[PDB]
């Protein structure tokens, strides 16, 4: 069966036909810091105020292509991500499906990372069986590039395509990230009220409330908790 010919005939995307840990999720849940969040207009904001340096950064800039305040790759590339990343550190960059697959790799290298994974969000259209001018094909997926600096899951997320105007990314990305046990200082840039999550510091322009305090935030990682992976037991007090 040729699902490409089938899509041409019926409009059902080939991915429509793909047929589809607990204790670990509990340890992650235990070591999670309380959710912390800050309203900040990232274009005008000195990201150096975001301390301490982060073990993981999830970067979800609102691209023009998501809508059919947008951020161009010009804007994104000028962010000083290397100033807030820990010496050993990870990034996850939502790059969309167009020029971002190239410009996002430029960003990663500009900030000192090398790509180790290319995670593809594959969008099924089982419920509703229009292209950018240079596009050769119908674009049915987005890419989240994983980068590393310093010294269970698969690189695919399959969900139904969200409603038009809904720019949310699949929450499965947080599960992949947290399952790597990369450290407990996790920053989500351009997060929203709807993405705030325990274990994460969310910073973005549309947040309606803030609770971030740099000293309070740093107190979560003071000794004996400075190096925890976020997948181990809490260190006992008293």
């Amino acid at each position: 069966n040729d699902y490409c010919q089938h899509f041409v005939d019926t409009g059902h995307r080939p991915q429509n036909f793909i047929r589809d840990i607990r204790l670990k999720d509990e340890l992650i849940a235990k070591s999670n810091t309380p959710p912390m969040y800050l309203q900040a207009d990232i274009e005008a904001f000195d990201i150096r105020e975001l301390t301490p340096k982060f073990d993981v950064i999830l970067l979800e800039p609102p691209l023009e292509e998501y809508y059919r305040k947008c951020w161009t790759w010009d804007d994104i590339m000028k962010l000083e991500i290397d100033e807030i990343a820990a010496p050993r550190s990870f990034i996850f960059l939502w790059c969309g499906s167009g020029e971002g697959l190239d410009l996002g790799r430029v960003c990663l290298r500009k900030w000192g990372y090398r790509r180790c994974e290319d995670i593809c969000w594959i969008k099924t259209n089982k419920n509703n069986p229009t292209l950018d001018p240079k596009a050769v094909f119908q674009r049915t997926k987005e890419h989240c590039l994983m980068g590393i600096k310093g010294t269970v899951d698969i690189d695919l997320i399959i969900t139904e395509e969200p409603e038009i105007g809904n720019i949310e990314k699949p929450v499965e990305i947080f599960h992949i990230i947290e399952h790597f046990c990369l450290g407990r200082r996790r920053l989500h840039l351009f997060g929203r009220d709807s993405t705030i999550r325990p274990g994460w510091l969310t910073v973005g322009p549309t947040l309606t409330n803030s609770n971030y305090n740099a000293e309070t935030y740093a107190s979560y990682f003071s000794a004996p908790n400075s190096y925890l992976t976020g997948c181990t037991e809490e260190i006992e007090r008293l």
Partner: protein, 202 residues
């Protein structure tokens, strides 16, 4: 000549100028990644030096990549004069449509580059995701040939680093595991005999 054609050769040394111009180029290069490898590989500089630019005036390049070739393949693509305008994902399944360092790999990537200004291609008929069964190691899905034919029906196409199971109508296949030379296009046959009178490509 519609029927399959091929040339067993070392692609580093063949004078690809004898072959003419193609609406589509596809390549599955033996990128030098990791070590060992059950086959012969090409160094990064050998890949950069491939004479891809002579093969098209206006058309599309399909370039399979993996690992660090996701970056090197973009370099070559741009160096050879293409702009990457799409990226195909082959989701690798078993016979029951189940998907087969930090993450397990469910897919392989095919960069799509454009050169010049191609006209009369049927852009947008297919989507950028292939779901197809894995076969022998490194065997790429045949669905890509149908996608490329619907995109550019009837035109001449060339595949680099193809194996015998890769030969297709309307395609000229180059690779070092092919069996001899099989050429039928008279224009190609003439230029091949003029350039290689003794049939010795070296």
């Amino acid at each position: 000549l519609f029927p399959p054609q091929w040339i067993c050769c070392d692609i580093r040394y063949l004078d690809v100028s004898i072959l003419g111009k193609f609406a589509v180029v596809m390549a599955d290069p033996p990128w030098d990644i990791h070590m060992e490898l059950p086959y012969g590989t090409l160094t990064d500089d050998e890949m950069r030096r491939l004479n891809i630019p002579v093969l098209q005036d206006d058309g599309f390049l399909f370039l399979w990549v993996t690992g660090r070739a996701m970056e090197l393949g973009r370099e070559c693509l741009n160096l050879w004069g293409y702009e990457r305008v799409d990226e195909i994902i082959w989701v690798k399944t078993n016979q029951l449509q189940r998907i087969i360092h930090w993450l397990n790999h469910g897919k392989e990537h095919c960069l799509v580059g454009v050169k010049g200004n191609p006209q009369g291609f049927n852009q947008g008929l297919d989507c950028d995701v292939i779901v197809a069964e894995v076969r022998s190691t490194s065997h790429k899905p045949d669905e890509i040939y149908g996608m490329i034919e619907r995109l550019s029906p009837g035109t001449r196409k060339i595949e680099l680093f193809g194996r015998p199971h890769n030969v297709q109508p309307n395609w000229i296949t180059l690779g070092n595991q092919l069996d001899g030379i099989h050429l039928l296009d008279p224009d190609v046959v003439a230029r091949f005999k003029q350039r290689y009178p003794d049939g010795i490509i070296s």
